[PDB]
């Protein structure tokens, strides 16, 4: 279904941005160990 795929694309884009943020915070914790 088209709505199904569109919702998946939106949620995976949000997840991609979230995981970029998560990698940034992991590097920040890396800098302070």
Swiss-Prot record:
Highest taxon above the source species: Eukaryota
Segments traversing the membrane: none
Modified residues (N6-acetyllysine): 10
Subcellular locations according to the entry: Cytoplasm, Cytoskeleton
Function comment: Cytoplasmic dynein 1 acts as a motor for the intracellular retrograde motility of vesicles and organelles along microtubules. Dynein has ATPase activity; the force-producing power stroke is thought to occur on release of ADP. Plays a role in mitotic spindle assembly and metaphase plate congression.
Domain notes: Dynein heavy chains probably consist of an N-terminal stem (which binds cargo and interacts with other dynein components), and the head or motor domain. The motor contains six tandemly-linked AAA domains in the head, which form a ring. A stalk-like structure (formed by two of the coiled coil domains) protrudes between AAA 4 and AAA 5 and terminates in a microtubule-binding site. A seventh domain may also contribute to this ring; it is not clear whether the N-terminus or the C-terminus forms this extra domain.
Disease: Charcot-Marie-Tooth disease, axonal, type 2O: An axonal form of Charcot-Marie-Tooth disease, a disorder of the peripheral nervous system, characterized by progressive weakness and atrophy, initially of the peroneal muscles and later of the distal muscles of the arms. Charcot-Marie-Tooth disease is classified in two main groups on the basis of electrophysiologic properties and histopathology: primary peripheral demyelinating neuropathies (designated CMT1 when they are dominantly inherited) and primary peripheral axonal neuropathies (CMT2). Cortical dysplasia, complex, with other brain malformations 13: An autosomal dominant disorder characterized by global developmental delay with impaired intellectual development. Some patients show signs of peripheral neuropathy, such as abnormal gait and hyporeflexia. CDCBM13 is associated with variable neuronal migration defects resulting in cortical malformations.
Family per similarity comment: Belongs to the dynein heavy chain family.
The protein's assembly and partners: Homodimer. The cytoplasmic dynein 1 complex consists of two catalytic heavy chains (HCs) and a number of non-catalytic subunits presented by intermediate chains (ICs), light intermediate chains (LICs) and light chains (LCs); the composition seems to vary in respect to the IC, LIC and LC composition. The heavy chain homodimer serves as a scaffold for the probable homodimeric assembly of the respective non-catalytic subunits. The ICs and LICs bind directly to the HC dimer and dynein LCs assemble on the IC dimer. Interacts with DYNC1LI1; DYNC1LI1 and DYNC1LI2 bind mutually exclusive to DYNC1H1.
Listed name of the protein: Cytoplasmic dynein 1 heavy chain 1
Organism: Homo sapiens (Human)
Lineage of source species: Eukaryota, Metazoa, Chordata, Craniata, Vertebrata
């Amino acid at each position: 279904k088209v709505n199904r795929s569109t919702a998946l694309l939106k949620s995976l884009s949000a997840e991609r941005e979230r995981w970029e943020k998560t990698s940034e915070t992991f590097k920040n914790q890396m800098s302070t160990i």
